[PDB]
Design a protein around this ligand. Structure first.
Ligand SMILES: NC(=O)c1ccc[n+]([C@@H]2O[C@H](COP(=O)([O-])OP(=O)(O)OC[C@H]3O[C@@H](n4cnc5c(N)ncnc54)[C@H](O)[C@@H]3O)[C@@H](O)[C@H]2O)c1
Length: 160
């Protein structure tokens, strides 16, 4: 029989102006099925109102079992990243973080390691306190380390 592929659909949460090209490398690995971004002009239209942004986030997260935060230098302070993490967690979805400063951006090279966005918050499910999982790729050749382990990392978050 012809072999098939089955990839988990995910929502990527990240700081665009610093990390969009690093996240592209993860898309290129072909391991997860993340939604592609809307165009810049479409994003500007969405951003005209807070309700529009929330509608877009809520709709994009709806059919996703896992939110994947790609952690760069400023991700922890992005207000819509906070909203996305909160929405995914409140909706019972998996939440996981991956540091991406060791992915080499064609423009900015290697990045500054940023704070863990999740550490600013206390997460609970059913009165248990949980810390979302965060993975730190190998300092040298982070691309290959991520590619080899990303699918498992997301399944670990799903089972949490
Ligand atoms: N186009 C998109 O899909 C898009 C863009 C930005 C943010 N977001 C959502 O908001 C969250 C927070 O991100 P943020 O804090 O960077 O938001 P933000 O609203 O602060 O980002 C605005 C910036 O996004 C850039 N941008 C928009 N569309 C882009 C694209 N297609 N490719 C490259 N750059 C693009 C613009 O340069 C702009 O400066 C993200 O996790 C994501 O869910 C989505």
């Amino acid at each position: 029989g012809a072999s098939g592929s089955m990839k988990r659909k995910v929502f990527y949460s990240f700081h665009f102006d610093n990390d969009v090209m690093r996240v592209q490398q993860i898309r290129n690995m072909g391991v997860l099925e993340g939604d592609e971004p809307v165009s810049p002009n479409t994003w500007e239209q969405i951003k005209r109102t807070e309700q529009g942004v929330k509608n877009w986030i809520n709709q994009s997260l709806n059919g996703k079992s896992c939110l994947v935060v790609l952690i760069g230098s400023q991700t922890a302070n992005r207000p819509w990243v906070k909203y996305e993490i909160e929405r995914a967690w409140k909706e019972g979805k998996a939440v996981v973080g991956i540091y991406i400063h060791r992915l080499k951006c064609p423009r900015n090279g290697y990045g500054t390691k940023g704070p863990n966005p999740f550490d600013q918050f206390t997460f609970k499910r059913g009165d248990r306190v949980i810390k979302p999982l965060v993975y730190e790729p190998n300092f040298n050749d982070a691309y290959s380390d991520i590619k080899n382990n990303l699918a498992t990392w997301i399944e670990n978050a799903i089972k949490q």
